[PDB]
Amino acid sequence: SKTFKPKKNIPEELLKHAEATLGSGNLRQAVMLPEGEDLNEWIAVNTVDFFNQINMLYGTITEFCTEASCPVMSAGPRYEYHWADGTPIKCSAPKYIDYLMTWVQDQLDDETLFPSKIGVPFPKNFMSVAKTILKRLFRVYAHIYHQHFDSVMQLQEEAHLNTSFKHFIFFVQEFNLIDRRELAPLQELIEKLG
Amino acid sequence: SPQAFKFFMEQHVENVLKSHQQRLHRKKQLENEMMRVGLSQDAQDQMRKMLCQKESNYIRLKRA
Ligand SMILES: [Zn+2]
């Protein structure tokens, strides 16, 4: 709300390379909570997987994402992001994303948030914690899609990106883990994947 | 180089699907044997519960 600043002062692509994917199969069914499975656990394992994918995704285009090319964290001109973790900064996309990925990593390493021992329950607020992570992880996708799809197509990794993002968004949507407002930066890519 | 991201995503999609069908498979196997020997619905539900907890434990461990 302070971290997510859409810009009403802006008058309002090739992104719809969206058919390009790998073997997603029945992905809508894949993201569903299996009968008897704990939602927290299911959120946790997928959040970790998505983090890994996104961590690798950004690794491919980080050379192209610099202070010069991206002096403010954005998802196109109509959306800017300021960093804050409650434990807000106008900063560049590389700075923001470094803050973000360290932050997410610390959560996942936090055994009190993401317990790895059998028998140890999730914290009472795990859902809210998971929702902030996924909310902010979405921004890497959005930044890359808006600012660096040229470099993605250069590396011929559009299919791999779409696959990752499609799965991410199908998961997010299944459990309503991100407010439709914050998904604004990619509404039409998303509507194109459903 | 983007080769690791690429290889992982190509490998990831089929891993997702395999994990999904393996859960179903173990679920089907349990139902099959239960029905074969004709256990009480209480005993069946207990063991279904046990399978679910084991599957839960499994993905926690994969995450670890
Ligand atoms: Zn950038």
From Swiss-Prot, chain A:
Entry-linked SMART domains: Mob1_phocein (SM01388)
Annotated gene: MOB1A
Quaternary structure (record): Binds STK38 and STK38L. Interacts with LATS1 and LATS2. Forms a tripartite complex with STK38 and STK3/MST2.
GO biological process: hippo signaling
Known tissue expression: Adrenal gland, bone marrow, brain, placenta, prostate, salivary gland, skeletal muscle, testis, thymus, thyroid gland, heart, spinal cord, fetal brain and fetal liver.
Protein family: Belongs to the MOB1/phocein family.
GO cellular component assignments: cytoplasm; cytosol; extracellular exosome; nucleus
Gene3D superfamilies with a match to the protein in the record: MOB kinase activator
Family matches, as SUPFAM superfamilies: Mob1/phocein (SSF101152)
Function statement: Activator of LATS1/2 in the Hippo signaling pathway which plays a pivotal role in organ size control and tumor suppression by restricting proliferation and promoting apoptosis. The core of this pathway is composed of a kinase cascade wherein STK3/MST2 and STK4/MST1, in complex with its regulatory protein SAV1, phosphorylates and activates LATS1/2 in complex with its regulatory protein MOB1, which in turn phosphorylates and inactivates YAP1 oncoprotein and WWTR1/TAZ.
Superkingdom of the organism of origin: Eukaryota
GO molecular function, one term: protein serine/threonine kinase activator activity
Keywords on record: Acetylation, Metal-binding, Phosphoprotein, Zinc
Post-translational modification comment from the UniProt entry: Phosphorylated by STK3/MST2 and STK4/MST1 and this phosphorylation enhances its binding to LATS1.
Protein name according to UniProt: MOB kinase activator 1A
In-chain residues carrying the UniProt-annotated modification Phosphothreonine: T3, T21, T60, T163
UniProtKB/Swiss-Prot annotation, chain B:
Reported modifications of this chain: Autophosphorylated and phosphorylated during M-phase of the cell cycle. Phosphorylated by MAP4Ks; in parallel to STK3/MST2 and resulting to its activation.
Tissue specificity: Expressed in all adult tissues examined except for lung and kidney.
Disulfide bond annotation, renumbered to this chain: none
Chain positions found as Phosphoserine: S40
Impact reported for M35I: In a lung adenocarcinoma sample; somatic mutation
Location within or outside the cell: Cytoplasm, Cytoskeleton, Microtubule organizing center, Centrosome; Cytoplasm, Cytoskeleton, Spindle; Midbody; Cytoplasm, Cytoskeleton, Microtubule organizing center, Spindle pole body
Function: Negative regulator of YAP1 in the Hippo signaling pathway that plays a pivotal role in organ size control and tumor suppression by restricting proliferation and promoting apoptosis. The core of this pathway is composed of a kinase cascade wherein STK3/MST2 and STK4/MST1, in complex with its regulatory protein SAV1, phosphorylates and activates LATS1/2 in complex with its regulatory protein MOB1, which in turn phosphorylates and inactivates YAP1 oncoprotein and WWTR1/TAZ.
Subunit structure comment from the entry: Complexes with CDK1 in early mitosis. LATS1-associated CDK1 has no mitotic cyclin partner and no apparent kinase activity. Binds phosphorylated ZYX, locating this protein to the mitotic spindle and suggesting a role for actin regulatory proteins during mitosis. Binds to and colocalizes with LIMK1 at the actomyosin contractile ring during cytokinesis. Interacts (via PPxY motif 2) with YAP1 (via WW domains). Interacts with MOB1A and MOB1B. Interacts with LIMD1, WTIP and AJUBA.
Family: Belongs to the protein kinase superfamily. AGC Ser/Thr protein kinase family.
The protein's name in its UniProt record: Serine/threonine-protein kinase LATS1
Phylogenetic lineage: Eukaryota, Metazoa, Chordata, Craniata, Vertebrata
Gene that encodes it: LATS1
Part of the full-length chain shown: 635 to 698 of 1130
